[PDB]
From Swiss-Prot:
Membrane topology of the entry: Multi-pass membrane protein
Stated role: Responsible for the cleavages located at the N-terminus of the replicase polyprotein. Participates together with nsp4 in the assembly of virally-induced cytoplasmic double-membrane vesicles necessary for viral replication. Antagonizes innate immune induction of type I interferon by blocking the phosphorylation, dimerization and subsequent nuclear translocation of host IRF3. Also prevents host NF-kappa-B signaling. In addition, PL-PRO possesses a deubiquitinating/deISGylating activity and processes both 'Lys-48'- and 'Lys-63'-linked polyubiquitin chains from cellular substrates.
Catalytic activity: Thiol-dependent hydrolysis of ester, thioester, amide, peptide and isopeptide bonds formed by the C-terminal Gly of ubiquitin (a 76-residue protein attached to proteins as an intracellular targeting signal)
Highest taxon of the lineage: Viruses
Documented activity regulation: Inhibited in vitro by GRL-0617.
Signal sequence residues: none
Protein name as annotated: Papain-like protease nsp3
Self-association state and partner proteins as the record states: May form homohexamers. Interacts with N protein.
Domain Macro span(s) in chain numbering: 1-167
Subcellular location: Host endoplasmic reticulum membrane
Length: 167
């Protein structure tokens, strides 16, 4: 039993809700919140910009030190950093950005990072401003993640489309 509330159950392990991931994180304080990161951990817009803003830029400060030490992530890769005031940890995961020409096959690799954590609050990887088809992202999530994932879909209209089209 966990403290996530109001989610629709899609499979044994995948749950979904129309919600602002920032507000959800502040309410639940999950062990892991997933960020829709880029390889530079430059948290400018979309989920990343919103999460970072909610940390008063502390996420960006921590991220800049991470990059200065370790260099960029790989597309499909991840790193674990602090969750600041939002969660215990933030798993920064880089899905492919179609608006940059990146290979959509890397979306499965990106979701594999979730399997290193028993429970996560997450967005749909490569959706929104990353330019992939969200119906596809949800399918890859369900077919790749085996741990317990609570998906927050910001756009209510998109949430309804995702539910009504889910196979
Ligand atoms: C990744 C695509 C989704 N983006 C988000 N999902 C959940 N919480 C969010 N907070 C700020 C953006 C955002 C879109 C609504 O389908
Ligand atoms: Cl987005």
């Amino acid at each position: 039993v966990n403290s996530f509330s109001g989610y629709l159950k899609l499979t044994d392990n995948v749950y979904i809700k129309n919600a602002d991931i920032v507000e959800e994180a502040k309410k639940v304080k999950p062990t892991v919140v997933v960020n829709a990161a880029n390889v530079y951990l430059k948290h400018g817009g979309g989920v990343a910009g919103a999460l970072n803003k909610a940390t008063n830029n502390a996420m960006q400060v921590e991220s800049d030190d991470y990059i200065a030490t370790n260099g960029p992530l790989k597309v499909g890769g991840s790193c674990v950093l602090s969750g600041h005031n939002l969660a215990k940890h933030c798993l920064h995961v880089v899905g492919p950005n179609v608006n940059k020409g990146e290979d959509i096959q890397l979306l499965k690799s990106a979701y594999e990072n979730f399997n290193q954590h028993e429970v996560l609050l997450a967005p749909l990887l490569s959706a929104g401003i990353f330019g992939a088809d969200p119906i596809h992202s949800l399918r890859v999530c369900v077919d790749t993640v085996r741990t317990n994932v609570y998906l927050a879909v910001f756009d209510k209209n998109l949430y309804d489309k995702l539910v009504s089209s889910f196979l």
